[PDB]
Design an enzyme around this catalytic site. Structure first.
Site, PDB file in Angstrom:
ATOM      1  N   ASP B  25       0.812  -1.221   0.000  1.00  9.94           N
ATOM      2  CA  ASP B  25       0.000   0.000   0.000  1.00  9.94           C
ATOM      3  C   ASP B  25       0.846   1.272   0.000  1.00  9.94           C
ATOM      4  O   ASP B  25       1.285   1.766   1.043  1.00  9.94           O
ATOM      5  CB  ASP B  25      -0.908  -0.029   1.223  1.00  9.94           C
ATOM      6  CG  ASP B  25      -1.943   1.066   1.235  1.00  9.94           C
ATOM      7  OD1 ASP B  25      -1.948   1.937   0.332  1.00  9.94           O
ATOM      8  OD2 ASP B  25      -2.770   1.036   2.165  1.00  9.94           O
ATOM      9  N   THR B  26       1.042   1.816  -1.193  1.00  8.42           N
ATOM     10  CA  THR B  26       1.824   3.043  -1.401  1.00  8.42           C
ATOM     11  C   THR B  26       1.179   4.273  -0.761  1.00  8.42           C
ATOM     12  O   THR B  26       1.860   5.262  -0.527  1.00  8.42           O
ATOM     13  CB  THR B  26       2.068   3.299  -2.895  1.00  8.42           C
ATOM     14  OG1 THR B  26       0.817   3.428  -3.590  1.00  8.42           O
ATOM     15  CG2 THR B  26       2.897   2.147  -3.531  1.00  8.42           C
ATOM     16  N   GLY B  27      -0.121   4.212  -0.468  1.00  6.49           N
ATOM     17  CA  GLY B  27      -0.801   5.318   0.201  1.00  6.49           C
ATOM     18  C   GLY B  27      -0.686   5.302   1.714  1.00  6.49           C
ATOM     19  O   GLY B  27      -1.204   6.199   2.378  1.00  6.49           O
TER      20      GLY B  27
HETATM   21  C1  017 Z   1      -6.579   1.052   4.113  1.00  8.66           C
HETATM   22  C2  017 Z   1      -6.748   0.677   2.647  1.00  8.66           C
HETATM   23  C3  017 Z   1      -7.190  -0.781   2.533  1.00  8.66           C
HETATM   24  C4  017 Z   1      -7.736   1.607   1.950  1.00  8.66           C
HETATM   25  N1  017 Z   1      -7.332   3.015   2.115  1.00  8.66           N
HETATM   26  C5  017 Z   1      -6.253   3.369   1.171  1.00  8.66           C
HETATM   27  C6  017 Z   1      -5.001   3.679   1.990  1.00  8.66           C
HETATM   28  O1  017 Z   1      -3.879   3.830   1.118  1.00  8.66           O
HETATM   29  C7  017 Z   1      -5.129   4.944   2.828  1.00  8.66           C
HETATM   30  C8  017 Z   1      -5.103   6.230   2.008  1.00  8.66           C
HETATM   31  C9  017 Z   1      -5.112   7.433   2.915  1.00  8.66           C
HETATM   32  C10 017 Z   1      -3.971   8.223   3.046  1.00  8.66           C
HETATM   33  C11 017 Z   1      -3.981   9.330   3.882  1.00  8.66           C
HETATM   34  C12 017 Z   1      -5.130   9.654   4.591  1.00  8.66           C
HETATM   35  C13 017 Z   1      -6.265   8.865   4.461  1.00  8.66           C
HETATM   36  C14 017 Z   1      -6.257   7.759   3.622  1.00  8.66           C
HETATM   37  N2  017 Z   1      -3.990   4.986   3.718  1.00  8.66           N
HETATM   38  C15 017 Z   1      -4.081   4.800   5.027  1.00  8.66           C
HETATM   39  O2  017 Z   1      -5.108   4.564   5.660  1.00  8.66           O
HETATM   40  O3  017 Z   1      -2.781   4.910   5.659  1.00  8.66           O
HETATM   41  C16 017 Z   1      -2.819   4.963   7.074  1.00  8.66           C
HETATM   42  C17 017 Z   1      -1.731   4.044   7.588  1.00  8.66           C
HETATM   43  O4  017 Z   1      -0.565   4.856   7.476  1.00  8.66           O
HETATM   44  C18 017 Z   1      -0.905   6.227   7.683  1.00  8.66           C
HETATM   45  O5  017 Z   1      -0.250   7.017   6.690  1.00  8.66           O
HETATM   46  C19 017 Z   1      -1.170   7.429   5.692  1.00  8.66           C
HETATM   47  C20 017 Z   1      -2.530   7.416   6.381  1.00  8.66           C
HETATM   48  C21 017 Z   1      -2.397   6.364   7.472  1.00  8.66           C
HETATM   49  S1  017 Z   1      -8.606   4.018   2.045  1.00  8.66           S
HETATM   50  O6  017 Z   1      -8.145   5.373   2.065  1.00  8.66           O
HETATM   51  O7  017 Z   1      -9.386   3.714   3.204  1.00  8.66           O
HETATM   52  C22 017 Z   1      -9.510   3.845   0.745  1.00  8.66           C
HETATM   53  C23 017 Z   1     -10.564   2.939   0.691  1.00  8.66           C
HETATM   54  C24 017 Z   1     -11.305   2.832  -0.485  1.00  8.66           C
HETATM   55  C25 017 Z   1     -10.983   3.633  -1.575  1.00  8.66           C
HETATM   56  N3  017 Z   1     -11.692   3.559  -2.719  1.00  8.66           N
HETATM   57  C26 017 Z   1      -9.941   4.538  -1.517  1.00  8.66           C
HETATM   58  C27 017 Z   1      -9.208   4.642  -0.349  1.00  8.66           C
END
Ligand code: 017
Lengths: 99, 99
Positions: B25-27
């Site tokens: 998960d790059t996000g």
């Molecule tokens: C948890 C995943 C299975 C899904 N998430 C994508 C994810 O990349 C999110 C994307 C993301 C990024 C930033 C803020 C909110 C969501 N990142 C995230 O929750 O990371 C958390 C863990 O490390 C921390 O650093 C970044 C946020 C924290 S998600 O944002 O909930 C999501 C769910 C469904 C869709 N369509 C789009 C996005």
């Protein structure tokens, strides 16, 4: 472009004549943006992430240009804390993970 | 290997003798897992995503083997709906985005 992951993989996106920055997010099924206005019809949807769920407007067949490459598909609009480009669009710009 | 994004980028991970599947998960800034139990000391932290925040246990200097490559770093343990491998580990296995 090959890009490493020492910093957030943020790209510039052009959508509906507006310029935004968004995260290239392999963990997201769908593209979700907060700070934009798309015209036209939409359908209500709820998506879930780490802290629970948000209500989103689902806009279909939306053109986006991400780092100067075009894609059409679903864009969700709602109270996400960060604009995210999800796999539904990443596949269209030929984006892959490599290690 | 190189991995396209038509399906979720799930990989097998071995952590603390346990076998789990996790999303590359790059996000995600950091790794977060739900269905595991690491021994030893930890610090409280809250992390936020779509939906808001969850409380997690932060465990430092944890060894993980992700698709057979080793990484040591921070692992958060908490009520995430999906196990996620974040950037702080992705960098250690030489993971990049390409398009
Ligand atoms: C948890 C995943 C299975 C899904 N998430 C994508 C994810 O990349 C999110 C994307 C993301 C990024 C930033 C803020 C909110 C969501 N990142 C995230 O929750 O990371 C958390 C863990 O490390 C921390 O650093 C970044 C946020 C924290 S998600 O944002 O909930 C999501 C769910 C469904 C869709 N369509 C789009 C996005």
């Amino acid at each position: 472009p090959q890009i490493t992951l020492w910093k957030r993989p943020l790209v510039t996106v052009k959508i509906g004549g507006q310029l935004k920055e968004a995260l290239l997010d392999t963990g997201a099924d769908d593209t979700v943006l907060e700070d934009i206005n798309l015209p036209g019809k939409w359908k209500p949807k709820m998506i879930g992430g780490i802290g629970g769920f948000i209500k989103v407007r689902q806009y279909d067949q939306i053109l986006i240009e991400i780092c100067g490459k075009k894609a059409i598909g679903t864009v969700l609009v709602g109270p996400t804390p960060v604009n995210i480009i999800g796999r539904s669009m990443l596949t269209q710009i030929g984006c892959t993970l490599n290690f």
